[PDB]
Amino acid sequence: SLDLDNLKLLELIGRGRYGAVYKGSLDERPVAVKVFSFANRQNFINEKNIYRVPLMEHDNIARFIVGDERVTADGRMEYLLVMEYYPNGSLCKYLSLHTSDWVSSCRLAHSVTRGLAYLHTELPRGDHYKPAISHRDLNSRNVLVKNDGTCVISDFGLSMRLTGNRLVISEVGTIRYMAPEVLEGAVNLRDCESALKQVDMYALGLIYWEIFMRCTDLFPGESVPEYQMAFQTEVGNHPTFEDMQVLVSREKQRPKFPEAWKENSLAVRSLKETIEDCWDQDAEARLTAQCAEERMAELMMIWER
Ligand SMILES: Nc1ncnc2c1ncn2[C@@H]1O[C@H](COP(=O)(O)OP(=O)(O)O)[C@@H](O)[C@H]1O
Ligand SMILES: [Mg+2]
């Protein structure tokens, strides 16, 4: 199909700050449909354009189908982005509902990291040149879970190409996931490309924390705590940029590792180190996504505890 006459909208399945998301049907096939109002036009153009970059199809990037303007029956402008429908919803929602064993949690962490490494990596392939991309608002709500328990990265409304022909306020993402240099207005734009990959990597660390806070094998003989976002106990819901700057940049705080994680094991010690190397104060000392994928691959495969 790929033509918005054949498009039927069913129930709402989510919303963020730019779009409302509905389950739908495009010529008999289940799909998900992200609806932008006129005010959010630029975010639509950005997201569509990032999805249409050559070689953006990947197991760990959300599957885009078609995007275009559709005027309402009332003569208002809307933008519709049609993509594959993921019944598990966002990683945040999945983690709310589910705990997972070691292999499953590593699968979630490894698949998200693989997506981000793919996104971050420039593919200079002539007619199919893929630029390096930064997500710019990486978090649990912008990651979706497939039916196989692997993740895809979604929501490229704020993403930016970092290499290639046509380029470039940093204070634009979700506040709780902002790196300290973002909260300081200190992002070092001399090396645009590295600085912005490093900003995603910090957020990746927070994502890791949320995933493993829900791993059954990290809380042996005990209850796994109910799901909470990174920093939720410290700052609550909807922190201000100011309050976050104090906690994260000034006080250098990070989500705490439970006492239940006794690091007399290689698996746990390397888990903690990998998370800590992602959300490091020194942007330049943070793991790359490729290094992080290898860390997570190795943890997934660790034989015995
Ligand atoms: N393809 C999809 N399948 C299932 N749920 C989705 C899909 N895309 C988005 N969602 C849900 O809708 C929410 C908002 O989508 P998102 O694209 O992040 O919009 P925004 O840019 O406004 O935050 C997500 O957090 C997720 O819960
Ligand atoms: Mg979003």
Residue numbers in the entry: 197 to 364, 374 to 510
Paper text:
Diffracting crystals were obtained in the presence of the ligand ADP and the crystal structure was solved and refined at a resolution of 2.35 Å. Two protein molecules were present in the asymmetric unit. Both chains formed an identical interaction with Mg-ADP, but showed minor differences in the partially disordered activation loop as well as the C-terminus through which crystal contacts were formed. The structure reveals a conserved fold with other type II receptors with a pattern of specific kinase domain insertions that define the BMP/TGF-β receptor family. Consistent with this view, the kinase domain structure of BMPR2 shows an active conformation as evidenced by the correct positioning of the αC helix, as well as the catalytic residues within the ATP-binding pocket which are captured in complex with Mg-ADP. The correct positioning of the αC helix is evidenced by the 2.8 Å salt bridge formed between the catalytic residues Lys230 (β3 strand) and Glu243 (αC helix). Canonical interactions are also observed with Mg-ADP, including two hydrogen bonds with the kinase hinge region and further hydrogen bonds with the catalytic loop and phosphate-binding loop (β1-β2), also known as the glycine-rich loop. The activation loop (A-loop) makes surprisingly few contacts with the catalytic domain. However, a minor deviation from this state is apparent from some localized disorder in the activation loop. This observation potentially reflects the requirement for this flexible region to bind to the substrate type I receptor as they receptors assemble together upon extracellular ligand binding.
